[PDB]
mmCIF file of C-alpha atoms (C1' of nucleotides) and ligand atoms in Angstrom:
data_model
loop_
_atom_site.group_PDB
_atom_site.id
_atom_site.type_symbol
_atom_site.label_atom_id
_atom_site.label_comp_id
_atom_site.label_asym_id
_atom_site.label_seq_id
_atom_site.Cartn_x
_atom_site.Cartn_y
_atom_site.Cartn_z
ATOM 1 C CA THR A 1 19.844 68.491 185.566
ATOM 2 C CA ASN A 2 17.468 70.949 183.255
ATOM 3 C CA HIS A 3 15.817 73.075 186.029
ATOM 4 C CA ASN A 4 14.286 75.382 183.497
ATOM 5 C CA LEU A 5 12.515 72.969 181.150
ATOM 6 C CA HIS A 6 9.406 74.640 180.804
ATOM 7 C CA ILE A 7 10.923 77.655 179.893
ATOM 8 C CA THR A 8 13.473 76.038 177.384
ATOM 9 C CA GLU A 9 10.523 73.945 176.024
ATOM 10 C CA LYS A 10 8.902 77.024 174.661
ATOM 11 C CA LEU A 11 12.126 78.972 173.797
ATOM 12 C CA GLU A 12 12.944 76.191 171.409
ATOM 13 C CA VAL A 13 9.600 76.334 169.366
ATOM 14 C CA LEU A 14 10.522 80.106 168.801
ATOM 15 C CA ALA A 15 14.082 79.412 168.094
ATOM 16 C CA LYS A 16 13.011 76.261 165.297
ATOM 17 C CA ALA A 17 10.413 78.911 163.821
ATOM 18 C CA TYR A 18 13.626 81.453 163.289
ATOM 19 C CA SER A 19 15.832 78.409 162.553
ATOM 20 C CA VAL A 20 13.198 77.343 159.121
ATOM 21 C CA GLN A 21 12.829 80.963 158.210
ATOM 22 C CA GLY A 22 16.724 81.427 157.579
ATOM 23 C CA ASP A 23 17.040 83.643 160.469
ATOM 24 C CA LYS A 24 20.219 81.942 161.287
ATOM 25 C CA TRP A 25 22.101 84.337 163.656
ATOM 26 C CA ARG A 26 18.726 85.048 165.664
ATOM 27 C CA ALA A 27 18.388 81.278 165.884
ATOM 28 C CA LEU A 28 21.933 81.029 166.938
ATOM 29 C CA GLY A 29 21.714 83.374 169.894
ATOM 30 C CA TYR A 30 18.443 81.605 170.926
ATOM 31 C CA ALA A 31 20.834 78.297 170.754
ATOM 32 C CA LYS A 32 23.219 79.634 173.063
ATOM 33 C CA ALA A 33 20.815 81.142 175.464
ATOM 34 C CA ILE A 34 18.725 78.014 175.634
ATOM 35 C CA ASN A 35 21.730 75.914 176.571
ATOM 36 C CA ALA A 36 22.776 78.243 178.943
ATOM 37 C CA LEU A 37 19.256 77.920 180.694
ATOM 38 C CA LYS A 38 19.602 74.108 180.629
ATOM 39 C CA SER A 39 23.093 74.324 182.578
ATOM 40 C CA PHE A 40 22.117 76.523 184.828
ATOM 41 C CA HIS A 41 22.288 74.955 188.552
ATOM 42 C CA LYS A 42 18.889 76.355 189.569
ATOM 43 C CA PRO A 43 15.577 77.335 188.047
ATOM 44 C CA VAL A 44 15.647 81.253 187.196
ATOM 45 C CA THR A 45 13.871 83.034 189.775
ATOM 46 C CA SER A 46 14.585 86.908 188.340
ATOM 47 C CA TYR A 47 15.139 88.915 185.291
ATOM 48 C CA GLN A 48 18.453 90.185 186.845
ATOM 49 C CA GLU A 49 19.397 86.362 187.519
ATOM 50 C CA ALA A 50 18.671 85.851 183.851
ATOM 51 C CA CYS A 51 20.751 88.948 182.733
ATOM 52 C CA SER A 52 23.304 87.748 184.625
ATOM 53 C CA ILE A 53 23.884 84.412 182.518
ATOM 54 C CA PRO A 54 26.326 84.608 179.764
ATOM 55 C CA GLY A 55 23.993 84.032 176.511
ATOM 56 C CA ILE A 56 21.300 86.054 177.897
ATOM 57 C CA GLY A 57 20.527 89.660 177.162
ATOM 58 C CA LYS A 58 17.282 91.853 177.903
ATOM 59 C CA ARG A 59 15.309 90.458 175.174
ATOM 60 C CA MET A 60 15.901 87.092 176.282
ATOM 61 C CA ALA A 61 15.427 87.755 180.025
ATOM 62 C CA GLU A 62 12.015 89.045 179.061
ATOM 63 C CA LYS A 63 10.631 86.063 177.683
ATOM 64 C CA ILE A 64 12.180 83.824 180.341
ATOM 65 C CA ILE A 65 10.441 85.928 182.970
ATOM 66 C CA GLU A 66 7.293 86.010 180.886
ATOM 67 C CA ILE A 67 7.098 82.297 180.647
ATOM 68 C CA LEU A 68 8.125 82.134 184.703
ATOM 69 C CA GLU A 69 5.266 84.418 185.616
ATOM 70 C CA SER A 70 2.411 83.779 183.314
ATOM 71 C CA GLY A 71 3.376 79.907 181.936
ATOM 72 C CA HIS A 72 3.034 80.856 178.474
ATOM 73 C CA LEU A 73 4.901 82.660 175.770
ATOM 74 C CA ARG A 74 2.372 85.215 173.706
ATOM 75 C CA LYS A 75 4.726 85.253 170.434
ATOM 76 C CA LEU A 76 4.311 81.803 170.022
ATOM 77 C CA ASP A 77 0.714 82.506 169.273
ATOM 78 C CA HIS A 78 1.856 84.783 166.613
ATOM 79 C CA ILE A 79 4.282 82.617 164.658
ATOM 80 C CA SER A 80 3.745 82.685 160.843
ATOM 81 C CA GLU A 81 1.576 80.001 159.715
ATOM 82 C CA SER A 82 4.245 79.217 156.896
ATOM 83 C CA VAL A 83 6.861 78.000 159.541
ATOM 84 C CA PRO A 84 5.150 74.266 159.941
ATOM 85 C CA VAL A 85 5.303 74.035 156.155
ATOM 86 C CA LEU A 86 8.404 75.330 155.989
ATOM 87 C CA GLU A 87 9.723 73.087 158.639
ATOM 88 C CA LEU A 88 7.974 70.052 156.857
ATOM 89 C CA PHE A 89 10.006 71.129 153.866
ATOM 90 C CA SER A 90 13.146 71.705 155.624
ATOM 91 C CA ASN A 91 12.973 68.161 157.035
ATOM 92 C CA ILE A 92 14.009 66.687 153.816
ATOM 93 C CA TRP A 93 17.839 66.022 153.635
ATOM 94 C CA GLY A 94 18.904 68.028 150.964
ATOM 95 C CA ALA A 95 16.797 70.958 151.146
ATOM 96 C CA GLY A 96 17.244 73.836 153.312
ATOM 97 C CA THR A 97 15.558 77.213 153.906
ATOM 98 C CA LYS A 98 16.181 78.743 150.472
ATOM 99 C CA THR A 99 14.399 75.937 148.848
ATOM 100 C CA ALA A 100 11.494 75.563 151.619
ATOM 101 C CA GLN A 101 10.632 79.089 150.863
ATOM 102 C CA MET A 102 10.994 78.687 147.165
ATOM 103 C CA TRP A 103 8.736 75.802 147.308
ATOM 104 C CA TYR A 104 5.988 77.457 149.445
ATOM 105 C CA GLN A 105 6.546 80.437 147.215
ATOM 106 C CA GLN A 106 5.371 78.281 144.479
ATOM 107 C CA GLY A 107 2.380 77.201 146.512
ATOM 108 C CA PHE A 108 3.289 73.692 147.771
ATOM 109 C CA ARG A 109 1.983 73.027 151.018
ATOM 110 C CA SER A 110 2.442 69.053 151.651
ATOM 111 C CA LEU A 111 4.902 66.318 150.838
ATOM 112 C CA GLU A 112 2.394 65.316 148.267
ATOM 113 C CA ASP A 113 2.988 68.400 146.547
ATOM 114 C CA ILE A 114 6.765 68.361 146.753
ATOM 115 C CA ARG A 115 6.527 64.845 145.129
ATOM 116 C CA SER A 116 4.325 65.569 142.414
ATOM 117 C CA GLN A 117 5.227 69.105 141.322
ATOM 118 C CA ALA A 118 8.542 70.322 142.751
ATOM 119 C CA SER A 119 11.701 69.944 140.921
ATOM 120 C CA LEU A 120 14.346 67.865 143.515
ATOM 121 C CA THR A 121 18.160 67.298 143.445
ATOM 122 C CA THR A 122 19.126 63.664 143.537
ATOM 123 C CA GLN A 123 19.826 64.403 147.390
ATOM 124 C CA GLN A 124 16.273 65.895 147.837
ATOM 125 C CA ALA A 125 14.888 62.642 145.856
ATOM 126 C CA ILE A 126 16.402 60.387 148.292
ATOM 127 C CA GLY A 127 15.604 62.701 151.460
ATOM 128 C CA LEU A 128 11.808 62.379 150.280
ATOM 129 C CA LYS A 129 11.864 58.821 149.766
ATOM 130 C CA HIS A 130 13.031 58.329 153.013
ATOM 131 C CA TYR A 131 11.593 61.128 154.985
ATOM 132 C CA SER A 132 9.847 59.278 157.665
ATOM 133 C CA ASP A 133 12.788 56.659 158.115
ATOM 134 C CA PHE A 134 15.407 59.911 158.486
ATOM 135 C CA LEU A 135 12.973 61.859 160.877
ATOM 136 C CA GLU A 136 13.138 58.992 163.366
ATOM 137 C CA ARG A 137 15.832 59.041 165.667
ATOM 138 C CA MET A 138 17.099 55.318 165.971
ATOM 139 C CA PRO A 139 17.550 53.502 169.406
ATOM 140 C CA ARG A 140 21.379 53.336 170.205
ATOM 141 C CA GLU A 141 21.621 49.719 169.890
ATOM 142 C CA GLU A 142 20.581 49.714 166.296
ATOM 143 C CA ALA A 143 23.294 52.160 165.678
ATOM 144 C CA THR A 144 25.426 49.723 167.545
ATOM 145 C CA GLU A 145 24.707 47.168 165.193
ATOM 146 C CA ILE A 146 25.493 49.714 162.171
ATOM 147 C CA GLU A 147 28.672 50.833 163.576
ATOM 148 C CA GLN A 148 29.858 47.533 163.955
ATOM 149 C CA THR A 149 28.506 46.407 160.269
ATOM 150 C CA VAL A 150 31.038 48.960 159.033
ATOM 151 C CA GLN A 151 34.012 47.948 161.713
ATOM 152 C CA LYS A 152 33.361 44.458 160.468
ATOM 153 C CA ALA A 153 33.735 45.140 156.643
ATOM 154 C CA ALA A 154 36.814 47.622 157.634
ATOM 155 C CA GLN A 155 38.701 45.528 159.763
ATOM 156 C CA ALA A 156 38.506 42.630 157.222
ATOM 157 C CA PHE A 157 41.044 44.595 155.131
ATOM 158 C CA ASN A 158 43.336 45.586 158.429
ATOM 159 C CA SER A 159 42.533 44.235 161.562
ATOM 160 C CA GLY A 160 44.336 47.098 163.313
ATOM 161 C CA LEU A 161 41.833 49.838 161.870
ATOM 162 C CA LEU A 162 40.447 51.766 164.732
ATOM 163 C CA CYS A 163 36.829 52.407 164.375
ATOM 164 C CA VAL A 164 34.753 54.533 166.309
ATOM 165 C CA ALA A 165 31.029 55.896 166.647
ATOM 166 C CA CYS A 166 31.076 59.421 167.251
ATOM 167 C CA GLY A 167 28.325 61.915 167.383
ATOM 168 C CA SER A 168 25.442 61.815 169.940
ATOM 169 C CA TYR A 169 26.178 57.893 170.225
ATOM 170 C CA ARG A 170 29.665 58.640 171.492
ATOM 171 C CA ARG A 171 27.784 61.322 174.057
ATOM 172 C CA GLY A 172 25.957 58.696 175.545
ATOM 173 C CA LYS A 173 22.340 59.501 174.025
ATOM 174 C CA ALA A 174 19.457 57.064 174.209
ATOM 175 C CA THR A 175 18.394 57.833 170.519
ATOM 176 C CA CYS A 176 20.687 58.630 167.531
ATOM 177 C CA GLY A 177 19.743 60.693 164.469
ATOM 178 C CA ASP A 178 21.975 59.115 162.275
ATOM 179 C CA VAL A 179 25.154 57.157 162.638
ATOM 180 C CA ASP A 180 28.739 58.525 162.451
ATOM 181 C CA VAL A 181 31.589 56.401 162.206
ATOM 182 C CA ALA A 182 35.298 57.779 162.363
ATOM 183 C CA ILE A 183 38.204 55.444 161.082
ATOM 184 C CA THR A 184 41.602 55.521 161.174
ATOM 185 C CA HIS A 185 45.095 53.556 162.130
ATOM 186 C CA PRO A 186 47.778 53.811 164.992
ATOM 187 C CA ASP A 187 50.148 52.893 161.815
ATOM 188 C CA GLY A 188 49.996 56.394 160.282
ATOM 189 C CA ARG A 189 49.822 54.899 157.084
ATOM 190 C CA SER A 190 47.593 51.918 156.257
ATOM 191 C CA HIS A 191 44.595 54.327 156.678
ATOM 192 C CA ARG A 192 45.282 55.069 153.284
ATOM 193 C CA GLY A 193 43.380 53.671 150.525
ATOM 194 C CA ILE A 194 40.333 51.941 152.309
ATOM 195 C CA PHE A 195 37.814 54.036 151.476
ATOM 196 C CA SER A 196 37.141 52.649 148.159
ATOM 197 C CA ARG A 197 37.475 49.109 149.428
ATOM 198 C CA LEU A 198 35.325 49.616 152.556
ATOM 199 C CA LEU A 199 32.430 51.604 150.150
ATOM 200 C CA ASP A 200 32.582 48.721 147.699
ATOM 201 C CA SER A 201 32.528 45.978 150.757
ATOM 202 C CA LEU A 202 29.612 47.644 152.241
ATOM 203 C CA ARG A 203 27.868 48.073 148.856
ATOM 204 C CA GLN A 204 28.135 44.393 147.665
ATOM 205 C CA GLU A 205 26.591 43.394 151.137
ATOM 206 C CA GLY A 206 23.733 45.647 150.017
ATOM 207 C CA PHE A 207 24.149 47.535 153.151
ATOM 208 C CA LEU A 208 24.322 50.937 151.532
ATOM 209 C CA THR A 209 21.684 51.917 149.548
ATOM 210 C CA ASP A 210 22.190 55.399 148.401
ATOM 211 C CA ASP A 211 24.840 57.942 148.320
ATOM 212 C CA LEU A 212 24.417 61.774 149.289
ATOM 213 C CA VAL A 213 28.211 62.754 149.271
ATOM 214 C CA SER A 214 31.308 60.867 148.025
ATOM 215 C CA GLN A 215 33.934 62.061 145.933
ATOM 216 C CA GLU A 216 35.634 58.858 145.074
ATOM 217 C CA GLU A 217 38.003 60.010 142.225
ATOM 218 C CA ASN A 218 39.944 61.439 145.000
ATOM 219 C CA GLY A 219 42.349 59.090 146.848
ATOM 220 C CA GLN A 221 38.992 61.980 149.949
ATOM 221 C CA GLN A 222 38.223 61.448 153.830
ATOM 222 C CA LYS A 223 34.387 61.873 153.962
ATOM 223 C CA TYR A 224 31.163 59.676 153.162
ATOM 224 C CA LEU A 225 27.538 60.805 153.387
ATOM 225 C CA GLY A 226 24.947 58.040 152.563
ATOM 226 C CA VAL A 227 22.199 55.704 153.639
ATOM 227 C CA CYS A 228 22.560 52.258 154.796
ATOM 228 C CA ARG A 229 19.985 49.244 156.314
ATOM 229 C CA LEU A 230 20.638 46.774 158.366
ATOM 230 C CA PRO A 231 19.367 43.505 157.553
ATOM 231 C CA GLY A 232 16.301 41.738 158.282
ATOM 232 C CA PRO A 233 12.528 42.295 158.080
ATOM 233 C CA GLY A 234 11.144 45.831 158.719
ATOM 234 C CA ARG A 235 14.562 47.551 158.940
ATOM 235 C CA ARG A 236 14.231 51.200 158.341
ATOM 236 C CA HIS A 237 16.910 53.439 156.201
ATOM 237 C CA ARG A 238 19.387 55.158 158.107
ATOM 238 C CA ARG A 239 21.659 57.907 157.540
ATOM 239 C CA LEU A 240 25.325 57.007 157.520
ATOM 240 C CA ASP A 241 28.390 59.183 157.694
ATOM 241 C CA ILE A 242 31.836 57.894 157.784
ATOM 242 C CA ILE A 243 35.116 59.568 158.051
ATOM 243 C CA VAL A 244 38.674 58.134 157.132
ATOM 244 C CA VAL A 245 41.295 60.445 158.774
ATOM 245 C CA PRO A 246 45.196 60.130 159.512
ATOM 246 C CA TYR A 247 46.348 59.036 163.036
ATOM 247 C CA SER A 248 47.855 62.366 163.444
ATOM 248 C CA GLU A 249 44.673 64.080 163.236
ATOM 249 C CA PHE A 250 42.477 61.649 165.122
ATOM 250 C CA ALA A 251 42.093 63.625 168.315
ATOM 251 C CA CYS A 252 40.572 66.626 166.403
ATOM 252 C CA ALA A 253 38.633 64.325 164.177
ATOM 253 C CA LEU A 254 37.198 62.736 167.216
ATOM 254 C CA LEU A 255 36.517 65.673 168.884
ATOM 255 C CA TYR A 256 34.627 67.262 165.721
ATOM 256 C CA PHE A 257 32.806 64.170 165.132
ATOM 257 C CA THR A 258 31.757 63.944 168.583
ATOM 258 C CA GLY A 259 30.189 67.362 169.069
ATOM 259 C CA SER A 260 28.044 68.503 169.738
ATOM 260 C CA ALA A 261 27.907 71.445 166.783
ATOM 261 C CA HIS A 262 27.225 74.111 169.401
ATOM 262 C CA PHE A 263 29.866 72.478 171.919
ATOM 263 C CA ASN A 264 32.345 72.861 168.516
ATOM 264 C CA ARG A 265 31.231 76.328 167.480
ATOM 265 C CA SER A 266 31.710 77.710 171.075
ATOM 266 C CA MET A 267 35.328 75.739 171.356
ATOM 267 C CA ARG A 268 36.446 77.267 167.968
ATOM 268 C CA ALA A 269 35.357 80.398 169.365
ATOM 269 C CA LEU A 270 37.432 80.305 172.248
ATOM 270 C CA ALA A 271 40.323 78.924 170.393
ATOM 271 C CA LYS A 272 40.211 82.023 168.050
ATOM 272 C CA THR A 273 39.857 84.606 170.913
ATOM 273 C CA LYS A 274 43.159 82.889 172.145
ATOM 274 C CA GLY A 275 45.181 83.615 168.784
ATOM 275 C CA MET A 276 44.439 79.820 167.791
ATOM 276 C CA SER A 277 42.016 78.117 165.281
ATOM 277 C CA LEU A 278 40.420 74.840 165.701
ATOM 278 C CA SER A 279 39.115 72.409 163.091
ATOM 279 C CA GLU A 280 38.373 68.762 162.240
ATOM 280 C CA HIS A 281 42.037 68.550 161.033
ATOM 281 C CA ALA A 282 44.061 70.287 163.727
ATOM 282 C CA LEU A 283 44.779 72.634 166.443
ATOM 283 C CA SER A 284 47.010 75.077 165.194
ATOM 284 C CA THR A 285 48.054 78.764 165.634
ATOM 285 C CA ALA A 286 46.100 82.048 164.450
ATOM 286 C CA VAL A 287 45.429 81.829 160.883
ATOM 287 C CA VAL A 288 47.596 84.012 158.356
ATOM 288 C CA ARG A 289 46.508 87.707 157.516
ATOM 289 C CA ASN A 290 47.054 90.389 155.122
ATOM 290 C CA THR A 291 47.126 94.134 156.161
ATOM 291 C CA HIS A 292 43.297 94.213 155.577
ATOM 292 C CA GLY A 293 42.179 91.376 157.860
ATOM 293 C CA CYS A 294 41.962 88.492 155.412
ATOM 294 C CA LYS A 295 43.209 85.343 155.773
ATOM 295 C CA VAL A 296 45.614 83.916 153.345
ATOM 296 C CA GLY A 297 47.383 81.001 155.200
ATOM 297 C CA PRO A 298 46.983 78.435 157.913
ATOM 298 C CA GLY A 299 48.569 78.780 161.151
ATOM 299 C CA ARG A 300 51.029 76.393 162.359
ATOM 300 C CA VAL A 301 49.504 72.948 163.621
ATOM 301 C CA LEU A 302 50.202 72.309 167.161
ATOM 302 C CA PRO A 303 50.258 68.319 167.665
ATOM 303 C CA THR A 304 47.458 66.776 169.590
ATOM 304 C CA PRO A 305 47.896 63.225 170.299
ATOM 305 C CA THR A 306 44.478 63.183 172.444
ATOM 306 C CA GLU A 307 41.321 64.884 172.740
ATOM 307 C CA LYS A 308 42.819 65.960 176.445
ATOM 308 C CA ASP A 309 45.555 67.652 174.851
ATOM 309 C CA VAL A 310 43.367 70.059 172.835
ATOM 310 C CA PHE A 311 41.640 70.905 175.726
ATOM 311 C CA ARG A 312 45.213 71.429 177.612
ATOM 312 C CA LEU A 313 46.268 73.836 174.675
ATOM 313 C CA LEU A 314 43.284 75.829 174.785
ATOM 314 C CA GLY A 315 43.391 76.197 178.648
ATOM 315 C CA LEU A 316 40.075 74.498 179.179
ATOM 316 C CA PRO A 317 39.118 71.519 181.871
ATOM 317 C CA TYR A 318 38.876 68.284 179.974
ATOM 318 C CA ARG A 319 35.129 66.799 179.416
ATOM 319 C CA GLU A 320 33.837 63.667 178.774
ATOM 320 C CA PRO A 321 31.672 63.284 175.571
ATOM 321 C CA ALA A 322 28.829 63.151 177.538
ATOM 322 C CA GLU A 323 29.699 66.579 178.750
ATOM 323 C CA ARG A 324 29.771 68.210 175.568
ATOM 324 C CA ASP A 325 25.993 67.582 174.908
ATOM 325 C CA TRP A 326 25.202 71.208 173.852
ATOM 326 C "C1'" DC B 1 26.930 98.725 165.115
ATOM 327 C "C1'" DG B 2 29.360 94.390 162.929
ATOM 328 C "C1'" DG B 3 30.455 89.680 163.836
ATOM 329 C "C1'" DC B 4 28.757 85.536 164.741
ATOM 330 C "C1'" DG B 5 33.025 77.972 163.426
ATOM 331 C "C1'" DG B 6 35.948 75.679 160.544
ATOM 332 C "C1'" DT B 7 35.263 73.008 156.706
ATOM 333 C "C1'" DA B 8 33.660 70.198 152.154
ATOM 334 C "C1'" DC B 9 30.430 68.605 148.402
ATOM 335 C "C1'" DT B 10 27.214 69.105 144.714
ATOM 336 C "C1'" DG B 11 25.403 71.317 140.349
ATOM 337 C "C1'" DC C 1 28.869 80.888 143.594
ATOM 338 C "C1'" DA C 2 24.623 79.460 146.115
ATOM 339 C "C1'" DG C 3 22.880 76.264 148.606
ATOM 340 C "C1'" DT C 4 23.550 72.432 151.862
ATOM 341 C "C1'" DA C 5 25.600 69.669 154.810
ATOM 342 C "C1'" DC C 6 28.567 67.364 158.945
ATOM 343 C "C1'" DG D 1 19.222 86.469 169.143
ATOM 344 C "C1'" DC D 2 23.886 87.885 172.256
ATOM 345 C "C1'" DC D 3 28.447 90.264 173.121
ATOM 346 C "C1'" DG D 4 32.036 93.573 172.561
HETATM 347 N N1 LIG E 1 26.883 72.296 161.682
HETATM 348 C C1 LIG E 1 27.312 71.272 162.668
HETATM 349 C C2 LIG E 1 26.994 69.831 162.477
HETATM 350 C C3 LIG E 1 27.632 68.764 162.968
HETATM 351 N N2 LIG E 1 28.903 68.993 163.681
HETATM 352 C C4 LIG E 1 29.394 68.044 163.749
HETATM 353 C C5 LIG E 1 29.100 67.791 165.360
HETATM 354 C C6 LIG E 1 28.272 66.549 165.552
HETATM 355 O O1 LIG E 1 28.079 66.031 166.906
HETATM 356 C C7 LIG E 1 28.932 65.784 164.587
HETATM 357 C C8 LIG E 1 27.772 65.129 164.121
HETATM 358 O O2 LIG E 1 26.781 65.783 163.524
HETATM 359 P P1 LIG E 1 24.992 65.110 163.674
HETATM 360 O O3 LIG E 1 24.643 65.595 162.695
HETATM 361 O O4 LIG E 1 25.281 63.472 163.321
HETATM 362 O O5 LIG E 1 24.535 65.429 165.159
HETATM 363 P P2 LIG E 1 24.528 64.494 166.387
HETATM 364 O O6 LIG E 1 25.399 63.299 166.101
HETATM 365 O O7 LIG E 1 25.289 65.321 167.338
HETATM 366 O O8 LIG E 1 23.404 64.634 167.002
HETATM 367 P P3 LIG E 1 21.929 63.652 166.181
HETATM 368 O O9 LIG E 1 21.471 62.547 166.853
HETATM 369 O O10 LIG E 1 20.783 64.239 165.930
HETATM 370 O O11 LIG E 1 22.482 63.016 164.906
HETATM 371 O O12 LIG E 1 29.298 66.624 163.558
HETATM 372 C C9 LIG E 1 29.375 70.164 163.876
HETATM 373 O O13 LIG E 1 30.403 70.570 163.984
HETATM 374 N N3 LIG E 1 28.439 71.081 162.929
HETATM 375 CA CA1 LIG E 2 24.468 61.546 164.461
HETATM 376 CA CA1 LIG E 3 25.514 62.858 160.781
#
DNA sequence: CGGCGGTACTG
DNA sequence: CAGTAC
DNA sequence: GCCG
């Protein structure tokens, strides 16, 4: 469906360069531009046509036409030499751009330098230890196996527990970066307490190997960690689990499915219509002072299904595969 | 030009 | 609070 | 980077 693949391919490189350098807004504009380019019903044939597309302005149109007519993008040949290294360091889970810059500034140029000389948080050490595993997208069959491991451990405490793999898996992609499992109960009550029990059950199976984010003191809806399927040669994989009350399930699912750019656009649109959208609920506009500052949430508008959220936002419903932005 | 999603942990 | 993540 |  992407009729501008040669253009978007080269735009994404520049976008990634801006991203690993910490120019997050520039990268955002690029992301919206590239998404708009991939959804266009036709290969772009002129500057004027490109400019008429939302998300694309003069500066982006210049590059689009440059790639269209020459087949190349000169700016790519002028990208800083630090960028491949900053990208290398950014590929470590737990390490972002500030950290990458700092490491580069300290002279580090390889994962080996990071291993032997760099100061690493617990999360960064886990990310470094499983660098290759976490960087490799898994086949969705493996994601299925992981999801059903979690589901099997969950429904053992309560067979009525609903478990849905979200993220790229739910959007139907052939490969997944990590497994995203949402859990709830139509009951409305028996979703409570299952967090500790599920985590313990998965730990005793030897399924969970590392924890990145899990605040267990709190009787907590989110877990970020690492798992590995039983059997020889199995890779470590990133696993994220959310447990939500049924009344929020639709917004949770929607959030979890994404994609992230889809979520940002949808929340922006909600904001323009005097509403607020989060993983918890679709609500009315947040409460503000004389100053523009927010001081309180808006009133929750009940949403049993994703379609209800689309409805209350005045949007045509889209299946998960149509949210793959 | 200023704003750019809404949220949550870790240390 | 800065950084990072979903 | 784009948009209003
Ligand atoms: N900045 C972000 C990152 C993620 N998400 C949400 C939407 C995503 O779909 C979901 C899962 O995040 P992932 O990092 O797992 O991204 P995907 O599953 O969509 O793709 P991938 O296969 O690369 O993991 O969380 C979001 O709202 N905002
Ligand atoms: Ca994922
Ligand atoms: Ca994830």
